[PDB]
Amino acid sequence: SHEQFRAALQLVVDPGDPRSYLDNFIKIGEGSTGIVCIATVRSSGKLVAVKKMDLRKQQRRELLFNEVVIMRDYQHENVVEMYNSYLVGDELWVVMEFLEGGALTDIVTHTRMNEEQIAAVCLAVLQALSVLHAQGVIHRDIKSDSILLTHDGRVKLSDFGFCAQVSKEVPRRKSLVGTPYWMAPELISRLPYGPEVDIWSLGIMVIEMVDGEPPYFNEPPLKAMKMIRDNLPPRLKNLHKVSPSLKGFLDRLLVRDPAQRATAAELLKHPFLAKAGPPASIVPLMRQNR
């Protein structure tokens, strides 16, 4: 069964073993599905990232295919580029673009973003989501941890391990997936849902960028979910620290009824995004420059 699954993965991944061309693996991160390492390409000295996922440690093993489906089919400026996949012993390894600026989480937990920087993040994320959503791909784990940065401040969406596809034949998903504090209310309620859930989750990430943490963050996950489900949309702690344009923007995101929530395509036209600075504006937020 584990052996059964390893055989199945073998048929979809690239042959061989990237240890044959990579040196000096150093762990830089963890997620829910496994670890992320930096590695050096021996021929070039260039750096790549390698995501390692133990097949025996997944809640839903079959979701590991999402790594392969996205790599093969859905590449974009604001999406982390995946180069090759391999089966190495009991682990799936994906060799991918190294985002040397780290994750948006390290920024929001340690500094205050201004609205030029917030708008720049939101615009980049919404450009990615508009393209993904138009092809039926729902990310389902939008949060600051999934947004990665280059040294020069370019913003890219990562961690597609929990994504799903909708289509005319499967118009909604039903699975309980994501990270509790960021989950849409319709998804916690176990209603069938669509791309709208990413827009809610993006709202919660805006609250992260303003407040430093999502709502209810010092409640246990199950209680926080219950509160998201039953209560009016969560509020900024610091409502006085946001412009009316940012507040107006956020009110299109954190809408309980998914039919009334803005779509990514609509949000790209919102006047808040007119504030977006260039990638350069993000650079001073990163650990190496603060």
């Binding site: 989480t105 949060k143 990270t179 509790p180 963050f217």
Partner: peptide, 7 residues
């Protein structure tokens, strides 16, 4: 509490 841990 304060869980950056997915499902």
């Amino acid at each position: 509490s304060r869980a950056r841990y997915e499902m």
